[PDB]
Amino acid sequence: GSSGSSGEKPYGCNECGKDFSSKSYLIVHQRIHTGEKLSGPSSG
Ligand SMILES: [Zn+2]
């Protein structure tokens, strides 16, 4: 006996290992990662 699907925090971040209760909260977070261009003073 159950009303219906009881999904909870189905989304997560593998990059770091976080968990969000919404696809948005995640997509917004994952951002903190991306944005790392190669062009830099420490090429090697
Ligand atoms: Zn992350």
PDB file of N, CA, C and O and ligand atoms in Angstrom:
ATOM      1  N   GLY A   1       0.807  -1.207   0.000  1.00  0.00           N
ATOM      2  CA  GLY A   1       0.000   0.000   0.000  1.00  0.00           C
ATOM      3  C   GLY A   1       0.842   1.260   0.000  1.00  0.00           C
ATOM      4  O   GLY A   1       1.516   1.565   0.984  1.00  0.00           O
ATOM      5  N   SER A   2       0.806   1.995  -1.107  1.00  0.00           N
ATOM      6  CA  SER A   2       1.577   3.227  -1.233  1.00  0.00           C
ATOM      7  C   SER A   2       0.972   4.139  -2.295  1.00  0.00           C
ATOM      8  O   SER A   2       0.682   3.706  -3.409  1.00  0.00           O
ATOM      9  N   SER A   3       0.784   5.407  -1.940  1.00  0.00           N
ATOM     10  CA  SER A   3       0.211   6.381  -2.861  1.00  0.00           C
ATOM     11  C   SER A   3       0.853   6.270  -4.240  1.00  0.00           C
ATOM     12  O   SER A   3       0.168   6.070  -5.241  1.00  0.00           O
ATOM     13  N   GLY A   4       2.176   6.401  -4.283  1.00  0.00           N
ATOM     14  CA  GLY A   4       2.890   6.312  -5.543  1.00  0.00           C
ATOM     15  C   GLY A   4       4.393   6.397  -5.365  1.00  0.00           C
ATOM     16  O   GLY A   4       4.901   6.270  -4.251  1.00  0.00           O
ATOM     17  N   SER A   5       5.106   6.611  -6.466  1.00  0.00           N
ATOM     18  CA  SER A   5       6.561   6.707  -6.428  1.00  0.00           C
ATOM     19  C   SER A   5       7.016   7.598  -5.277  1.00  0.00           C
ATOM     20  O   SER A   5       6.456   8.670  -5.048  1.00  0.00           O
ATOM     21  N   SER A   6       8.036   7.146  -4.554  1.00  0.00           N
ATOM     22  CA  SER A   6       8.566   7.898  -3.423  1.00  0.00           C
ATOM     23  C   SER A   6      10.021   8.287  -3.663  1.00  0.00           C
ATOM     24  O   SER A   6      10.846   8.240  -2.752  1.00  0.00           O
ATOM     25  N   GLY A   7      10.329   8.673  -4.898  1.00  0.00           N
ATOM     26  CA  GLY A   7      11.685   9.063  -5.238  1.00  0.00           C
ATOM     27  C   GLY A   7      12.233  10.123  -4.303  1.00  0.00           C
ATOM     28  O   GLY A   7      11.503  11.012  -3.867  1.00  0.00           O
ATOM     29  N   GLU A   8      13.523  10.028  -3.994  1.00  0.00           N
ATOM     30  CA  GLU A   8      14.166  10.986  -3.103  1.00  0.00           C
ATOM     31  C   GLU A   8      15.633  11.179  -3.480  1.00  0.00           C
ATOM     32  O   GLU A   8      16.397  10.216  -3.559  1.00  0.00           O
ATOM     33  N   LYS A   9      16.018  12.428  -3.712  1.00  0.00           N
ATOM     34  CA  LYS A   9      17.392  12.751  -4.079  1.00  0.00           C
ATOM     35  C   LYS A   9      17.911  11.787  -5.142  1.00  0.00           C
ATOM     36  O   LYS A   9      18.973  11.180  -5.000  1.00  0.00           O
ATOM     37  N   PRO A  10      17.146  11.644  -6.236  1.00  0.00           N
ATOM     38  CA  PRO A  10      17.510  10.758  -7.345  1.00  0.00           C
ATOM     39  C   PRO A  10      18.709  11.276  -8.132  1.00  0.00           C
ATOM     40  O   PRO A  10      19.349  10.528  -8.869  1.00  0.00           O
ATOM     41  N   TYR A  11      19.007  12.561  -7.969  1.00  0.00           N
ATOM     42  CA  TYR A  11      20.129  13.178  -8.666  1.00  0.00           C
ATOM     43  C   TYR A  11      21.335  13.318  -7.742  1.00  0.00           C
ATOM     44  O   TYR A  11      21.189  13.427  -6.525  1.00  0.00           O
ATOM     45  N   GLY A  12      22.527  13.313  -8.331  1.00  0.00           N
ATOM     46  CA  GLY A  12      23.741  13.439  -7.546  1.00  0.00           C
ATOM     47  C   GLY A  12      24.916  13.929  -8.372  1.00  0.00           C
ATOM     48  O   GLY A  12      24.857  13.943  -9.601  1.00  0.00           O
ATOM     49  N   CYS A  13      25.986  14.332  -7.695  1.00  0.00           N
ATOM     50  CA  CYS A  13      27.179  14.825  -8.371  1.00  0.00           C
ATOM     51  C   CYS A  13      28.352  13.871  -8.172  1.00  0.00           C
ATOM     52  O   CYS A  13      28.790  13.638  -7.045  1.00  0.00           O
ATOM     53  N   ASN A  14      28.857  13.323  -9.272  1.00  0.00           N
ATOM     54  CA  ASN A  14      29.980  12.394  -9.218  1.00  0.00           C
ATOM     55  C   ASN A  14      31.304  13.146  -9.119  1.00  0.00           C
ATOM     56  O   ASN A  14      32.240  12.688  -8.465  1.00  0.00           O
ATOM     57  N   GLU A  15      31.371  14.303  -9.772  1.00  0.00           N
ATOM     58  CA  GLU A  15      32.581  15.117  -9.756  1.00  0.00           C
ATOM     59  C   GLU A  15      33.154  15.214  -8.345  1.00  0.00           C
ATOM     60  O   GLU A  15      34.332  14.935  -8.121  1.00  0.00           O
ATOM     61  N   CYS A  16      32.312  15.614  -7.398  1.00  0.00           N
ATOM     62  CA  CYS A  16      32.732  15.750  -6.009  1.00  0.00           C
ATOM     63  C   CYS A  16      32.092  14.671  -5.138  1.00  0.00           C
ATOM     64  O   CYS A  16      32.755  14.063  -4.299  1.00  0.00           O
ATOM     65  N   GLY A  17      30.800  14.441  -5.346  1.00  0.00           N
ATOM     66  CA  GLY A  17      30.092  13.437  -4.573  1.00  0.00           C
ATOM     67  C   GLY A  17      28.987  14.032  -3.723  1.00  0.00           C
ATOM     68  O   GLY A  17      28.794  13.633  -2.574  1.00  0.00           O
ATOM     69  N   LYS A  18      28.260  14.991  -4.287  1.00  0.00           N
ATOM     70  CA  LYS A  18      27.168  15.643  -3.573  1.00  0.00           C
ATOM     71  C   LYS A  18      25.824  15.041  -3.967  1.00  0.00           C
ATOM     72  O   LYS A  18      25.732  14.279  -4.931  1.00  0.00           O
ATOM     73  N   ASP A  19      24.783  15.386  -3.218  1.00  0.00           N
ATOM     74  CA  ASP A  19      23.442  14.880  -3.491  1.00  0.00           C
ATOM     75  C   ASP A  19      22.406  15.991  -3.357  1.00  0.00           C
ATOM     76  O   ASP A  19      22.361  16.696  -2.349  1.00  0.00           O
ATOM     77  N   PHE A  20      21.573  16.143  -4.382  1.00  0.00           N
ATOM     78  CA  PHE A  20      20.537  17.170  -4.379  1.00  0.00           C
ATOM     79  C   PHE A  20      19.157  16.550  -4.578  1.00  0.00           C
ATOM     80  O   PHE A  20      19.020  15.501  -5.210  1.00  0.00           O
ATOM     81  N   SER A  21      18.137  17.205  -4.035  1.00  0.00           N
ATOM     82  CA  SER A  21      16.767  16.718  -4.147  1.00  0.00           C
ATOM     83  C   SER A  21      16.072  17.326  -5.362  1.00  0.00           C
ATOM     84  O   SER A  21      14.846  17.422  -5.405  1.00  0.00           O
ATOM     85  N   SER A  22      16.866  17.736  -6.346  1.00  0.00           N
ATOM     86  CA  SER A  22      16.329  18.338  -7.561  1.00  0.00           C
ATOM     87  C   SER A  22      17.406  18.447  -8.636  1.00  0.00           C
ATOM     88  O   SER A  22      18.583  18.644  -8.334  1.00  0.00           O
ATOM     89  N   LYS A  23      16.994  18.316  -9.892  1.00  0.00           N
ATOM     90  CA  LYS A  23      17.921  18.400 -11.015  1.00  0.00           C
ATOM     91  C   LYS A  23      18.526  19.795 -11.117  1.00  0.00           C
ATOM     92  O   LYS A  23      19.671  19.956 -11.541  1.00  0.00           O
ATOM     93  N   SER A  24      17.752  20.802 -10.724  1.00  0.00           N
ATOM     94  CA  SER A  24      18.212  22.184 -10.774  1.00  0.00           C
ATOM     95  C   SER A  24      19.374  22.406  -9.811  1.00  0.00           C
ATOM     96  O   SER A  24      20.483  22.744 -10.225  1.00  0.00           O
ATOM     97  N   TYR A  25      19.111  22.213  -8.523  1.00  0.00           N
ATOM     98  CA  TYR A  25      20.133  22.394  -7.499  1.00  0.00           C
ATOM     99  C   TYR A  25      21.459  21.779  -7.937  1.00  0.00           C
ATOM    100  O   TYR A  25      22.529  22.327  -7.671  1.00  0.00           O
ATOM    101  N   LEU A  26      21.379  20.637  -8.611  1.00  0.00           N
ATOM    102  CA  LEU A  26      22.572  19.946  -9.088  1.00  0.00           C
ATOM    103  C   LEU A  26      23.224  20.714 -10.233  1.00  0.00           C
ATOM    104  O   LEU A  26      24.363  21.170 -10.118  1.00  0.00           O
ATOM    105  N   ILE A  27      22.496  20.855 -11.335  1.00  0.00           N
ATOM    106  CA  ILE A  27      23.003  21.571 -12.499  1.00  0.00           C
ATOM    107  C   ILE A  27      23.697  22.865 -12.089  1.00  0.00           C
ATOM    108  O   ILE A  27      24.751  23.213 -12.621  1.00  0.00           O
ATOM    109  N   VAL A  28      23.099  23.575 -11.136  1.00  0.00           N
ATOM    110  CA  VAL A  28      23.661  24.830 -10.652  1.00  0.00           C
ATOM    111  C   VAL A  28      24.988  24.598  -9.937  1.00  0.00           C
ATOM    112  O   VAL A  28      25.922  25.391 -10.065  1.00  0.00           O
ATOM    113  N   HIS A  29      25.065  23.507  -9.183  1.00  0.00           N
ATOM    114  CA  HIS A  29      26.278  23.168  -8.448  1.00  0.00           C
ATOM    115  C   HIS A  29      27.390  22.739  -9.401  1.00  0.00           C
ATOM    116  O   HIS A  29      28.471  23.324  -9.410  1.00  0.00           O
ATOM    117  N   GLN A  30      27.113  21.713 -10.199  1.00  0.00           N
ATOM    118  CA  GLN A  30      28.090  21.205 -11.155  1.00  0.00           C
ATOM    119  C   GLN A  30      28.878  22.347 -11.788  1.00  0.00           C
ATOM    120  O   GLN A  30      30.014  22.163 -12.225  1.00  0.00           O
ATOM    121  N   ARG A  31      28.266  23.526 -11.836  1.00  0.00           N
ATOM    122  CA  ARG A  31      28.910  24.698 -12.417  1.00  0.00           C
ATOM    123  C   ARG A  31      30.226  25.003 -11.708  1.00  0.00           C
ATOM    124  O   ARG A  31      31.247  25.247 -12.352  1.00  0.00           O
ATOM    125  N   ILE A  32      30.194  24.989 -10.380  1.00  0.00           N
ATOM    126  CA  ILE A  32      31.383  25.264  -9.585  1.00  0.00           C
ATOM    127  C   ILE A  32      32.591  24.504 -10.121  1.00  0.00           C
ATOM    128  O   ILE A  32      33.737  24.883  -9.875  1.00  0.00           O
ATOM    129  N   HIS A  33      32.328  23.430 -10.858  1.00  0.00           N
ATOM    130  CA  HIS A  33      33.394  22.617 -11.433  1.00  0.00           C
ATOM    131  C   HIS A  33      33.840  23.178 -12.780  1.00  0.00           C
ATOM    132  O   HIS A  33      34.921  23.755 -12.898  1.00  0.00           O
ATOM    133  N   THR A  34      32.998  23.005 -13.795  1.00  0.00           N
ATOM    134  CA  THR A  34      33.306  23.492 -15.134  1.00  0.00           C
ATOM    135  C   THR A  34      33.884  24.902 -15.087  1.00  0.00           C
ATOM    136  O   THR A  34      33.846  25.564 -14.050  1.00  0.00           O
ATOM    137  N   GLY A  35      34.420  25.355 -16.216  1.00  0.00           N
ATOM    138  CA  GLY A  35      34.999  26.685 -16.281  1.00  0.00           C
ATOM    139  C   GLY A  35      36.481  26.688 -15.971  1.00  0.00           C
ATOM    140  O   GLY A  35      37.011  27.667 -15.447  1.00  0.00           O
ATOM    141  N   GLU A  36      37.154  25.587 -16.294  1.00  0.00           N
ATOM    142  CA  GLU A  36      38.586  25.467 -16.043  1.00  0.00           C
ATOM    143  C   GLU A  36      39.359  25.341 -17.353  1.00  0.00           C
ATOM    144  O   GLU A  36      39.745  24.243 -17.757  1.00  0.00           O
ATOM    145  N   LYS A  37      39.581  26.472 -18.013  1.00  0.00           N
ATOM    146  CA  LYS A  37      40.308  26.491 -19.277  1.00  0.00           C
ATOM    147  C   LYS A  37      41.737  25.990 -19.090  1.00  0.00           C
ATOM    148  O   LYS A  37      42.261  25.976 -17.975  1.00  0.00           O
ATOM    149  N   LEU A  38      42.364  25.582 -20.187  1.00  0.00           N
ATOM    150  CA  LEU A  38      43.733  25.082 -20.145  1.00  0.00           C
ATOM    151  C   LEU A  38      44.732  26.233 -20.100  1.00  0.00           C
ATOM    152  O   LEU A  38      45.701  26.198 -19.342  1.00  0.00           O
ATOM    153  N   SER A  39      44.489  27.253 -20.917  1.00  0.00           N
ATOM    154  CA  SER A  39      45.368  28.416 -20.971  1.00  0.00           C
ATOM    155  C   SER A  39      45.703  28.910 -19.567  1.00  0.00           C
ATOM    156  O   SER A  39      44.857  29.483 -18.881  1.00  0.00           O
ATOM    157  N   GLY A  40      46.943  28.685 -19.147  1.00  0.00           N
ATOM    158  CA  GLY A  40      47.369  29.113 -17.828  1.00  0.00           C
ATOM    159  C   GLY A  40      48.878  29.180 -17.699  1.00  0.00           C
ATOM    160  O   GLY A  40      49.618  28.670 -18.540  1.00  0.00           O
ATOM    161  N   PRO A  41      49.356  29.826 -16.625  1.00  0.00           N
ATOM    162  CA  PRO A  41      50.791  29.975 -16.363  1.00  0.00           C
ATOM    163  C   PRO A  41      51.452  28.653 -15.986  1.00  0.00           C
ATOM    164  O   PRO A  41      52.674  28.524 -16.032  1.00  0.00           O
ATOM    165  N   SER A  42      50.635  27.674 -15.612  1.00  0.00           N
ATOM    166  CA  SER A  42      51.140  26.363 -15.223  1.00  0.00           C
ATOM    167  C   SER A  42      50.803  25.314 -16.278  1.00  0.00           C
ATOM    168  O   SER A  42      50.409  24.195 -15.954  1.00  0.00           O
ATOM    169  N   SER A  43      50.960  25.687 -17.545  1.00  0.00           N
ATOM    170  CA  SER A  43      50.668  24.782 -18.650  1.00  0.00           C
ATOM    171  C   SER A  43      51.064  23.351 -18.299  1.00  0.00           C
ATOM    172  O   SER A  43      50.243  22.437 -18.352  1.00  0.00           O
ATOM    173  N   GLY A  44      52.330  23.165 -17.938  1.00  0.00           N
ATOM    174  CA  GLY A  44      52.815  21.844 -17.583  1.00  0.00           C
ATOM    175  C   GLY A  44      52.929  21.652 -16.084  1.00  0.00           C
ATOM    176  O   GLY A  44      54.046  21.573 -15.574  1.00  0.00           O
TER     177      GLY A  44
HETATM  178 ZN    ZN B   1      30.123  18.427  -7.448  1.00  0.00          ZN
END
